[PDB]
A paper describes a structure:
In particular, the Hantaviridae family comprises the virus Hantaan (HTNV) that gives rise to haemorrhagic fevers with renal syndrome and the virus Sin Nombre that is linked to severe pulmonary illnesses with fatality rates up to 40%. The Bunyavirales genome is usually divided into three RNA segments enwrapped by the viral nucleoproteins (NP). The resulting nucleocapsids (NCs) protect the genome and serve as a replication/transcription template for the viral polymerase. In this context, HTNV-NCs are intriguing as they were shown to be able to form rather rigid helices of 10 nm diameter within viruses and during cell infection.
Expression of recombinant full-length HTNV-NP in insect cells led to formation of recombinant NCs that have a diameter consistent with native NCs. Cryo-EM images collected on a Titan Krios enabled structural determination of HTNV-NC at 3.3 Å resolution. HTNV-NC is a left-handed helix with a pitch of 68.03 Å and 3.6 subunits per turn. The structure of NP80-429 is composed of a core comprising residues 117 to 398 (NPcore) that defines two lobes surrounding a positively charged groove. As a result, Nt- and Ctarm of the same subunit embrace each other: residues 97–98 of Ntarm contact residues 423–424 of Ctarm, revealing a unique intra-arms interaction specific to HTNV-NC. Successive subunit interactions rely on exchange of their Ntarm, and Ctarm that make intimate contacts with the core domain of neighbouring protomers, resulting in a buried area of 2704 Å2 at each NP-NP interface. The two β-strands of the hairpin (residues 155–160 and 177–181) interact with the Ntarm residues 101–103 from the following subunit to form a 3-stranded β-sheet. In addition, the β-hairpin152-181 tip (residues 162–175) acts as a clamp and seals the C-terminus-mediated contacts between NPi+2 (residues 409 to 419) and NPi+3 (residues 385–390), thereby buttressing and rigidifying the metastable helical form of the HTNV-NC. Consistently, three nucleotides with a partial occupancy can be visualised for each NP. Conserved residues R197, R314, R368, R146 and K153 interact via salt bridges with RNA phosphates, in line with the versatility of RNA sequence to be incorporated by NP. The nucleotides bind in a continuous positively charged groove oriented towards the interior of the NC.
Residue numbers in the entry:
A (entry chain D), B (entry chain D), C (entry chain D), D (entry chain D): 80 to 245, 260 to 429
């Protein structure tokens, strides 16, 4: 019987549940400490050793064509090769490689090992002006309405800074700026001092025109540069909340069972909060509430929320897939 | 240590993940616009400059022997040479060449540059009668049951046109035909006017016997000829949905981890929809639902779905490969 | 500009992809049927018309010095000439020639036309005893450990036949022998009847000492002689699986991009299965699994897997080649 | 029909492939052992029986005018005759002859039989000083930039020996020298003892001014004299790698099909490695990497790489040749 029972199954009767995917425990370690954040000094000194076309091309392959690269080689380390990276060995142009690491769900990672989340965080923190000039937005930003918020940002943040607080909230951001100037580590001072000499252009305040473009490649946490600038980390929290809102709307739209509705939604604000508060900061929730009052409605009015397929078509095709797979084998049929 | 660590690795400890393939960013550009479709006027005037044996032989090497040509020289431009193409320089028969371009996953392409998808689209749109006469079906059509749908197409589409809609659906296709006769661009008018004078035989409606043979070489999108014929583009969407259904059944059949099940399935309907709606059309989903109700069951009953190897054999051989590769080097072992 | 653009290029800008090799469609036909196997009655009656020194010398030039002959004249027909072949025209010793045909990747072939795969199949099926006596193994057998499996074959197959099945598996092979004695064509009966009178020594069972030597010259499919002997065709499938295992290990060892890792591995078991099942047989997978359990480990322990060059040397030299070729012309630089 | 079919063709229809050259199996033996290297004791005692003008003149006809001699009489043994070689039979000056043997691709050779590769190896190992004095470089050395590496060799190797290793690498070569003084055969001791009494001047180390001139006549393997001198065999491997690099650049430059690009490149390092490791040595790859870091760039900067003919001219002429040959006969047209 092809759908009877597998070898090595330890129960003689067929279970009521169908079989599923195999969890590979080879790439997992146990002996790591429970809190092991990124180093962020080794990562910035590594990524500032390169020349910016290979960095922007790797950012393009991880953001705009990111789903294809994560579908092709996930669970392995990737070498990036370009003509612009050199190793001058007596005139021979030996290629220098960029190493990212695309981890699995079951995968212990090192402290300085660069995931694509860490890479997008570091590159979007270092070079926002080139991302602004090249209009390089990831598709996960493009579905929550990043483009309409970035059409007229120089007037948008000027109208936001002129609103009265509950004096305008420029004074509130200035008080936040003094509170962060008292409360910062020397590690971020080393990061700013190093990246200034590396040659990237810094950002002084949220009033800069290339300020929303720090979150254009959708980093997983706020970058170490533009951390103590008093109004940027809360703006990344605002965009993470918009991502979770879109995921809950898309999870509630789909007719289906309980576990796939639960599977379709995501927890981005929890991970953003954990990874941001781990860097020595306290997110003020009041500023996030100010952004939600300011442009929470226009973003949700400009979500994507596209119905991809006719539901009568999808139901019929998925039913036919399910009948065929339950005829052939004993696996759980995947979704169309 | 041969499996210790590579040179230029920037972390002193061995990572938990094995190394993988190198992504070459040399053939990628950034400064292209975000939407740059094909020209389709330059491509038709280029491919109608040739003589049909070199076109049908290149179609044979891209469809029937397509996997071997994409394995041999991928990431480069291919010259096709045949005796039938001339350049009469004072009697000297200088060979004229056909240029296709087989792109990589990391590769920006021009507007008029001919990929094999564009080539199969243009050739299958121009010359369906010779493909019908020579019985030239690609192996990706041969696994989703194209042959049994093309055995008796003249009676099949006659029984489909006689069914009552929810008057028969001939009136629905005629209303669709009037709606497309109002809504069409002058560019497709130029394509039809040019390809009529070039000498290829047109198709007037879906009732023609060489109508299913437009999708015999499996184009990536529906061709510019046979676009405004009201019932052909939805039939290509139906075949793309059949391809995605077969890929999901084959992905659910395989015992294995999550990422290789996700790697084995494909997204053909998304690309077909994007590339078809980019040409100035709106696919009516109702006609696709009509085709799925009509012959969705017979196609899935006639899928290939062949078990290629004994799974006990494949598991044993792949385990032995994995043990040997993990003994020798630090790369990720490929699948048998 | 020498690297600017070629004549006859139909696009004014330089493409991102470099140019590649020319595919010659002159030797390809379209009007062949989709399934056209070899005749195998004309081929055996042709190759038994000759005298065995010219056959063994042509087998030597196609197996042991086969890479040089396929590099020199590929895509053409080869005349083999020796003093031992005669045409007695009134005492004049006119030389008789052996015609093989080394086809290209783009090349339609006739039914009775002898490729080197067909030639190695026919010669290794007819004369295994002389190949055993002369120790004539091809280098593609020599890398998958054919010599250690052929050191002590008379004791090896005796220990395999004495193992208990899941009664020993001699009874299983005898049941397979009865099933093949019921199921065989008269064409193979004509082949055995003809080649017995031609003068070659037959093989009765797998217990013969010259039984592994049928696959010493590495045929592409199992020979028509020694087809219905119940245990030989599965042994050729076992050796084809060993070839694919070595090719996947060698493809996974090499640091490089995705398409050249995909290019380095081979699909030998698919072609062996297609060409063997086309001759009127059904390969029992259980016997192949028995061989993999029996001596799958010793063969993989005795693969060649030789690191040909220091990788630091190869990387440096290939980088220098790539820089020079990208300076000179617009072609894709070949591998060192 | 002159292009219809040949007599003795065994297939009634014309094949798609054109006919090619005849492989002559007369000069091939089968019963040789699989490893039969040169004797190198008989060859040195044979070539030291002569007087050096006939040796240098035969070296001139095999290196500098070598292509003409291999075009004229290939596949046969050559007698070399000069006035300087005697046979004193009671005062009569009977001429003594030098016998070389120019073998075919299909040709078994004896152990002591002198091919031109063996001859160039022995003569360039015995007499480097006269080759230095007469400036006798082969044209295959002249295209990979031997002259610029041999302009200032006494300062070049002095700057190489003074570089620090990873202490300078003189200590590394001295450690290699001690390792070879422990590991050498008595056969090479007999060769050095015999050739010292024959009258040729030995070489003590790589620091000698006539040290690069051992590889001026381009031997096929490193000579038996100057084998255990710790730094000379790796220098011959370096020059063989330069030959393979030039052949791959010239193979990638040519527009054409796949098999002639594959035909134009050569495998010299494989044959050099096989024939050198067969003499009882282990090539250290580190020294070859040191030479590639040292003067890999200057040699490739001084390759010949000459475009012999205008490609528009060559394409037109070759097309006209191909049309005429396909009109006349059924052979494959040769390249212009």
């Amino acid at each position: 019987d092809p759908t009877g029972v597998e070898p090595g199954d330890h129960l003689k009767e067929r279970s009521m549940l169908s079989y599923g995917n195999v969890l590979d425990l080879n790439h997992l370690d146990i002996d790591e400490p429970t809190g092991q954040t990124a180093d962020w000094l080794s990562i910035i000194v590594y990524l500032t050793s390169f020349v910016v076309p290979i960095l922007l091309k790797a950012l393009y392959m991880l953001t705009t064509r990111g789903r294809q690269t994560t579908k092709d080689n996930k669970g392995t380390r990737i070498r990036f090769k370009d003509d612009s990276s050199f190793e001058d060995v007596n005139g021979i142009r030996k290629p220098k490689h960029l190493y990212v690491s695309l981890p699995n769900a079951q995968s212990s990672m090192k402290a300085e090992e660069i995931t694509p989340g860490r890479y997008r965080t570091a590159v979007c923190g270092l070079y926002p002006a080139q991302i602004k000039a090249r209009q390089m937005i990831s598709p996960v930003m493009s579905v929550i309405g990043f483009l309409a918020l970035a059409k007229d940002w120089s007037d948008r943040i000027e109208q936001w800074l002129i609103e009265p607080c509950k004096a305008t909230n420029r004074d509130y951001l200035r008080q936040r700026q003094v509170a962060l100037g008292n409360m910062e580590t020397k590690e971020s001072k080393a990061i700013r001092q190093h990246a200034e000499a590396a040659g990237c252009s810094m950002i002084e305040d949220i009033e800069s025109p290339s300020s929303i473009w720090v979150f254009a490649g959708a980093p997983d946490r706020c970058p170490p540069t533009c951390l103590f600038i008093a109004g940027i980390a809360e703006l990344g929290a605002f965009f993470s909340i918009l991502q979770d809102m879109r995921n809950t709307i898309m999870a509630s739209k789909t007719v289906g069972t309980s576990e796939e509705k639960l599977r379709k939604k995501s927890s981005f604000y929890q991970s953003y909060l954990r990874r941001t508060q781990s860097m020595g900061i306290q997110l003020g929730q009041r500023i996030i509430v100010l952004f939600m009052v300011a442009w929470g409605k226009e973003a949700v009015d400009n979500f994507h929320l596209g119905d991809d397929m006719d539901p009568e078509l999808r139901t019929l095709a998925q039913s036919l897939i399910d009948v065929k797979v339950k005829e052939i084998s004993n696996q759980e049929p995947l979704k169309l």
